[PDB]
Structures are given as C-alpha cells and as structure tokens.
C-alpha cells in the first residue's frame, strides 16, 4: 500500500506500507529514509497525533492517505 508523509518544507515522502503496519513501524521507515530518530517524529492524521502502538488499520489510513510529520526535540 502507498501513503504519503508531508513535511514542513513541503517536501513529500512516499512510503509502501501494509494496513497491519504499526505507527512505530512507519516511524521506523521514515527514520530509515530520512535519518530522523522516531523520538523526534510526531505523526498527525485526521486532526490528531497518532500513537506508536496502533496500526494504520486502526486509524483507517487507506491507500494514498497523507500523513503529516512535525518534529519534536
């Protein structure tokens, strides 16, 4: 499945995932691709920040869905 992650500069990252992937998995992918530690990643979707222990399925994040990535310290 393909999803997107929009960053602050407007630069968009595309990820190939599975509906059973957890948010921590997604943060793992973003780290592997962008070099950003999961500790500094805040992922927002549908008006809220997503939690590490849940799946994309739990948030009804479908194909082509766009996730917003904002950074922490």
């Amino acid at each position: 499945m393909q999803i997107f992650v929009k960053t602050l500069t407007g630069k968009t990252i595309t990820l190939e995932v599975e509906p059973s992937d957890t948010i921590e998995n997604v943060k793992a992918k973003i780290q592997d691709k962008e070099g950003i530690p999961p500790d500094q990643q805040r992922l927002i979707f549908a008006g809220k920040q997503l939690e590490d222990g849940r799946t994309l399925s739990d948030y009804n994040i479908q194909k082509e869905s766009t996730l917003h990535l904002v950074l922490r310290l």
């Binding site: 927002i44 008006g47 809220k48 920040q49 766009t66 917003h68 904002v70 950074l71």
Partner: protein, 45 residues
Amino acid sequence: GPLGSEEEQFALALKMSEQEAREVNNQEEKEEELLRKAIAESLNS
C-alpha cells in the same frame, strides 16, 4: 538557536489533517447517499 514554533506547526498539521479527513468523509458520504438513492429507485420502480 531555535527560532521556529513546534506547537504552532503542530497546530497547523492538526488543522490541515482535520480538513483533509472531513473532505474524505464527505466524499464517502455522498457516494453512499447516491448508492442509497439508486437502490431505492431500483426497488420502488
């Protein structure tokens, strides 16, 4: 040193994400409404 605003861009992401979700839902909803209307037509006449 630090100059940007974390909770500010955090708030923006929440809002844009919010809007985006409302858009997706509205789409799914109209598509369901159209489906319901076609089913009613096909059974009522």
